[PDB]
Amino acid sequence: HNGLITKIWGTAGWTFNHAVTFGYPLNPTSDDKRRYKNYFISLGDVLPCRLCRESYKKFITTGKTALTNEVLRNRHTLTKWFYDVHNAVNNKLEVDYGLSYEDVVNKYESFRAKCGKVTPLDHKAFSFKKLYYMDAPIVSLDKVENFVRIARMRGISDKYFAFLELATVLNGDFNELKKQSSWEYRNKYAQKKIRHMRENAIPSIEEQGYWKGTPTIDELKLLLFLASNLNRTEVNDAINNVERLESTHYIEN
Amino acid sequence: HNGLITKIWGTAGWTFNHAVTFGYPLNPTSDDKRRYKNYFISLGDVLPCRLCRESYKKFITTGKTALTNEVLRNRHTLTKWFYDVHNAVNNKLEVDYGLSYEDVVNKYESFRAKCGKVTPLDHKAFSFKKLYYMDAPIVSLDKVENFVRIARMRGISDKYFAFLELATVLNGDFNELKKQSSWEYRNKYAQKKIRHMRENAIPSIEEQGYWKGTPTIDELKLLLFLASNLNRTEVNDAINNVERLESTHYIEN
Ligand SMILES: Cc1cc2nc3c(=O)[nH]c(=O)nc-3n(C[C@H](O)[C@H](O)[C@H](O)COP(=O)(O)OP(=O)(O)OC[C@H]3O[C@@H](n4cnc5c(N)ncnc54)[C@H](O)[C@@H]3O)c2cc1C
Ligand SMILES: Cc1cc2nc3c(=O)[nH]c(=O)nc-3n(C[C@H](O)[C@H](O)[C@H](O)COP(=O)(O)OP(=O)(O)OC[C@H]3O[C@@H](n4cnc5c(N)ncnc54)[C@H](O)[C@@H]3O)c2cc1C
């Protein structure tokens, strides 16, 4: 019939293909360059989703995401290129994670086989944490503040605003938030939540009732951690619905 | 330097590439066939591990794992082929999971985008469970029984033998064990364990002491669930060490 659900195969697709680029030689040979290029070209033919194939092809033939011999120069250039392609897809989907190229380098380099000290167990322990540790998507603080009132009105208790309070103090600056020890907790919390909703078919936007059009309680809890399942357009749309409800409420009482 | 740790990129590699095969048309065109074949041929050039590339190439040029136009006939033939390639690698590593082609079909088909009823949330809920639900490796009951005595002697309490007791009653028949409701629990338990050991650098074989050469307590708990981090050769080796210790003990007392 159709292709496969993007949220099922997507992450494995990225993790594996980013790993492929970090397995590229520091000094490829004309042969290596040709072998990898052809691989990445063929990748565009097999992604199990038509639209995905089209966007990817478009991306690899324009701008800085263009697959060219300069990209294939070395490991740095190849890994930087795929990092950019990944950003290109994120932007297309209007979702952000706030990861710098350096972040991606520190992550995948910890995967590098270090047959020193077969790789030692304490070294792999570190690698595995980096593999299992998921980076949840980010939403700017100015967007989230539009949901605080309704979150309170719907009964979400005080403990759920803790992280938001920390973020406010740091002016919603992600580069600073990422340096906080609690950033690790933020990601683990958001991940369990996102998984909880996915596994229990919990929608992000209220389908019926008075709250129709605004975030569900679980989605609100995610937003309070500057995370969300919604993309930029969907968040702004949710904000507009929340304000329709607040405005109309004010005028009737 | 080297390639990347196989246990970090491997699973994403399989999940994504199996998803690729299920995204293959029911009736490919000469063009499709050529496009996918070239992709899978190039896959062998980019796996971030030299030995892995060699084995894969060897596999796709011999026996039933050979990449040929007959394989590329349709979705059934292509998915059956990659399932066989996966089995080939499992056999090379001497690790088993007991998954039939049908098992793999039921799993990946649940990933198929079903734009009926954008795919509905309750449908995705099912898909996500299949994605997150990991199948832990299996070890035959006759192998495991060699570790029961030492497991008892080392203080492992009774609750850890529960599943083993169920398995004994079913004659260690995996096709029957997989039909049990507790099979789902078995896999979740083994998965957390395997992850716990990986994340905490807990070895599978005692490095020092009197128990040197035999499974560590955590490894023993896994074995009691007919699971293990050890491959066939390593399990038989562990058995031999356990018997050296039992035999020598008997003769000195
Ligand atoms: C080549 C390719 C093309 C795709 N094209 C589409 C498409 O057009 N449409 C569509 O709907 N889906 C597409 N997808 C899937 C989509 O990109 C997501 O993977 C999917 O929506 C799942 O999202 P997620 O939130 O579950 O996790 P993911 O987005 O898969 O994973 C989140 C993780 O991504 C990492 N990350 C984020 N940004 C970067 C970066 N720049 N570099 C490295 N790691 C980063 C973080 O560490 C975070 O933990 C594509 C996937 C691939 C592999
Ligand atoms: C193309 C390729 C070649 C590889 N070659 C090597 C190699 O030569 N040497 C090496 O050390 N590593 C190799 N690896 C990696 C290795 O196969 C494992 O993925 C890795 O050891 C991680 O094992 P794991 O136990 O963490 O999980 P994994 O083995 O990655 O995942 C376990 C999951 O595999 C699924 N599964 C098991 N059998 C099948 C099957 N036949 N069909 C579909 N799903 C199945 C189960 O559902 C189970 O949950 C290769 C990986 C790929 C993608």
Author numbering:
A (entry chain A), B (entry chain A): 32 to 148, 157 to 292
Give passages from the manuscript.
Mimivirus R596 is an enzyme of the Erv family of sulfhydryl oxidases, which catalyze the formation of disulfide bonds using an active-site di-cysteine motif juxtaposed to a flavin adenine dinucleotide (FAD) cofactor. Erv disulfide catalysts are apparently universal in eukaryotic species and are a highly conserved element of NCLDVs as well. Here we present the structure of the intact mimivirus sulfhydryl oxidase R596, including both its sulfhydryl oxidase domain and its ORFan domain. The mimivirus R596 enzyme contains an additional domain not found in other sulfhydryl oxidases from either cells or viruses, and this domain does not share detectable sequence homology with any other known protein.
Mimivirus R596-4C was crystallized in space group P6122 with one protomer in the asymmetric unit. Diffraction data were collected to 2.21 Å resolution. The R596-4C structure is highly helical and has a two-domain architecture. Rather than clustering spatially with the carboxy-terminal helices of R596, helix α6 packs against helix α5 from its own chain and helix α1 from the Erv domain of the other protomer (α1’). The tightly intertwined R596-4C dimer has a larger buried surface area (1150 Å2) than the R596Erv dimer alone (680 Å2). The R596-4C ORFan domain (R596-4CORFan, residues 180–292) is composed of six helices, α7 through α12. A structure similarity search found no close match for R596-4CORFan, suggesting that it represents a new fold. In contrast, residues 229 and 266, which are cysteines in wild-type R596 but alanines in R596-4C, are buried in the R596-4CORFan core and likely form a disulfide bond in the wild-type protein. In the R596-4C structure, these cysteines, Cys146 and Cys156, appear to be within 10 Å of the FAD-proximal cysteine pair, Cys 80 and Cys83, from the symmetry-related subunit (left). Notably, the lack of clear electron density seen for Cys146, Cys156, and the intervening loop in the R596-4C crystal structure (right) implies that the loop may be sufficiently mobile to approach the FAD-proximal cysteines.
